[PDB]
Amino acid sequence: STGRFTLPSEENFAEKTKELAELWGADAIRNSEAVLALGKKIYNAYFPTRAHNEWITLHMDETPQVYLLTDRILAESDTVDIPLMESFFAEQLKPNRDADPHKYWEVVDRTTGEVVDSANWTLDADEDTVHVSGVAAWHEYTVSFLAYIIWDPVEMYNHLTNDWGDKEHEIPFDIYHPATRKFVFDTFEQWLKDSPQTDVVRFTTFFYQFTLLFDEKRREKVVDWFGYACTVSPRALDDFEAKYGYRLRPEDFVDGGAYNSAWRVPRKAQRDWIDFLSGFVRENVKQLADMSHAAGKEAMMFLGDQWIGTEPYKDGFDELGLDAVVGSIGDGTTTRMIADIPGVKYTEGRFLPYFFPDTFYEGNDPSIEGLDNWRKARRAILRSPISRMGYGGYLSLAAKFPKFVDTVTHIANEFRDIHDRTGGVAAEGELNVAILNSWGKMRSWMAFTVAHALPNKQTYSYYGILESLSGMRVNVRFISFDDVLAHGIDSDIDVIINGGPVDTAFTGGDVWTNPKLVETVRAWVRGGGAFVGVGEPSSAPRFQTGRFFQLADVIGVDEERYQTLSVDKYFPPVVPDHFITADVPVDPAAREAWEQAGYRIPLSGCGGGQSIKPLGGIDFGEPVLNTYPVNENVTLLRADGGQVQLATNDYGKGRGVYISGLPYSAANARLLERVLFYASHNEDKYAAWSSSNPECEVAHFPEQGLYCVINNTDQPQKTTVTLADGTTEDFDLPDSGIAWREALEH
Template structure:
């Protein structure tokens, strides 16, 4: 996909002439439909490539009816219930769930796939002590308007614990059939699809069942035959949706973009047990209600399941992709919805053999998450805003959203270009906003220019190579600290800013897991600065991982020998009565006070004058959420507020460490991180003549092979900045959002 147009537009039936003119004007070389729209016939005759959305795990309602037991399954935990006495305790397992989404499955072996747990003691009850009976579905509360009537498959079940311990809390882990696709529920709720009598609710099926897998394969072959106009099969996606659960008022109840909850089935669990030598329990998925959130220090059983499932998904996806290729088409994967198990940065992804990946760009980090995927020929970013009525209606400001999206994405695109950009939704809606169309035209042209002027080269990286160290490592490349795709959460933005900054900074970034460091003495080779960022007790800062002695030893040795270490939030924090909260408190020269050390007086040694790291960072600083009280163990304190250290530096042997309370993404914080990385790597001497844009609002990319540079204003204000490096020193005045190309030979 090397032509220069690089734009995909969603089109639909109707408005034929307007759409053709718009395609011409914007230079779209590909078109696509989406769930719920059909491509017009005329498109086949045009030169544009045709993408078609293809669903592997839903949409074949004939099959969904025929193979009603082959639905996708999910382990759910009932609402915790406290026994007020030893009288029999009944739990209606569907309480709090949307009865249109799930139905309990008591046909599976209850002894293996249902579990009653006393959450007060943590013990699983013996099966003899409880029983389960079918029950009528709980009525829809108020969401009928939004999701329509209850499907016929809806039902519930009641578990009775014969003789509970008084005042213990009980839950039922139960296997549920998913009777309605999660993304479709989202669409019903967002776009009021319940009002459309022609809509059919998709019931997801599972390729873990051999008959379904046969059907999915043959359906694809037939579909390819009947859709000769399609050039690119856009798999949306493969087999298992990320965890997205709705509550009894049709509100989102649980969302984990990385969640594997909806990937279970009896056949797969049985295969797993054979292959791994042990059987997974419902609790291995339910995880006390945390459902193996990526913030949880991952447990071995869950990692095994991820490995098992992604191997399985890759092999089955490979078969479908081969079918597509055999039919002379391209295979593209949408990175979202049913992407679970594909793991683009995992061990098995390349086996799938995809031509391309497309994903939604919500930030620089999610852009890099797409553009850095190894082993595909091209990547495409679906830009925001989506052409949906939530934005494209009176009161919406699609231009502002387009600008925000572009400013975030451009930082990433400069460093690691997407090959294409595209849009999604209803083009007819967007066409009602001509200023939006104008802005899209500018954006796509700027995007094309980046490809043209860079000559396909990446801009030069600066010296320190960065390693992001957490429990997940490469598997979650550019995917740290995320709950729902690219959404803001109070508890994550202070850490997401780290990878959001890095996604646009001129450094090579690697993602390393604790296990790699523990198992491989050379895991840190080639890395100059390690970053450990996150809240206390999470997989990203580490939690129990830091009780590993080898991990501590290797990190200390790394810094002592001259490496850099940057901690953000509660780095290396672990529980335990061991004298410090941070395992590497000695390296950072700071620790976290958790209430046991209040008797120790704390004195901060403040840096005497301005420090390299904060040289051009204006106060007030923004360190985001307070991670808890940080106290000095000897670091030089650069900033302290509310009695807590927010920024401090320390020397440890030949190396350096930086502690920072949090780094929400802002231009200034990106600059602060940039400087901290350079300082931690002892590269500050090179700052002035290699890297600098004097104004942190402006970033600059150097293309030595092309003899040019690209300077871009990341803000909505007009700004001026001195750009210096590679012998150049020039002052640029940039319009809001402007990106400007210059020749390095234009030296002043």
């Protein structure tokens, strides 16, 4: 067992490097001499838009820029003054005074939405303050302005996170401006000649940084891992106007203060900017990779930091001729974002923990996180294989941890053995599942994300859906409403999933008032399709007084919006024993207390049929208030506390399912998997290649005559696997184990 492993190294550490490389089977070492003689592939970081304060300080007007939105200021009379910077980090951001503020900025009456006239406001010469006159008392006002980014955001993040205190703040730069651009390509040509020992240029990353703004208290103020805020300049804006035939407003970037969060329903202006900026970016990335290839070296892209405008899931990404993409393995979902990228020769995972004093300190046990991280990646990898694993940081730190070092030895051999046994071919998927949202394929595995791998109270009930699926024995694609309006639903999809809050990219907004969309979905379901809706699926506010989820008729459930309180809701009896809930641990105490307290008897203005006490047993995450069954032919599987959390509904040949929320857990992934088989009328096809125990999952490889079963926990798991022919085999799986077995070839 050797290879597919990238080892970090450091100055004055050649013995241990040699030792570890032997131990872990490393065929590549990453940068940070007697080591260069070891024969390995050599990776070297490259930071195209920073690491040259000597230049940018002589061209400060070519730093990158961002539109920023001030706090709202209440006018208590016909004039108002607006500080521009009271709410931002001055070390990070500076108002751009060089470029005519009347041409490129916007004062706005947020109370009315109206743009204040240019003649009515002046920028103070001596203070970062705007004076407004001729305005309305008791309205709120804001300025939207261009600010130079005078400190690279991620280095800033690392500086503050590590308290580098004294150390010099690295200034970033923007190759949209041609002097700076030339600087960057000369510097890169030069560096290649000065680096013959390097084999892989590890671009970390490219030209534009994802939205990451900090406030006057040195905290994160705004972030979006997909954000295009930090991509502007007067010349880019003006070139945009000429190319697209309309002028973007600053509002098109600040977006009422939302800064175009990917959760926002996508506006045409947004996408145009992505088109514009991404073409500029893509052309220049291809240059870097051509130059790389001409120096005999490979080009590798970090999925992160300055990755904006690359758009790896959009078409043509392959025309870049990038060799590889490497990324942070945070979980299943983030593993899949990497794995699934097409148009590279190979993919690579930077696993956790980062070799750093934060997790490598005396008394802490890094191997727990090591294995847990591997376990979450491994389940995904069986569905979409990455090519290489590796670690990052100070190798000397991890060397002081014997147990960890042995843990890695284990993971490395396992990773290789999964690859050798499988041939790097993805497990067979038993069902075709499509996530449907406004973004589709360009945000594959990127839905519900805000900051990378950091779900929170607001997102985790939907993120749970992707996490569950990332490792699930199904084929997962991402499709858009434009996809559906334009081409219908491809005939191979078994299930369509639509989840999220109302008025988001992930439910779709007012596209649900488009009858053409509603027709396509209804016909497909009726004909045999399956629609799973989570949260407020198919929602459209105000369109129909008495109908919030437009496909309430398909999933059998709607959400009361305080418009329909005069209409009693009659809940049919909950069906607690069902295919879908088959694996939910039963709790005798809870079940008989729920049996004993009965259903509510009908009563005026209150409807009836609602369990007086909760059945529970399933974590559905954040509640959707007052969901109810549209009539009594819907099957209710959970309807606790006066509303619906899980329901199924027959709809001609097809079915729809409602689920209020789905945090990730071994149990909920089992629930979701069951919903998928049940809604697609594929109860029959469920048992083939499955683990009876939900803590484990099964991967079939028909062309290699194989199947494995994996333990997703750090505890022993016994499970019963069922093969296609009906036969079964028992298993006792150790802590994080795996087991292979034959099955007829094809």
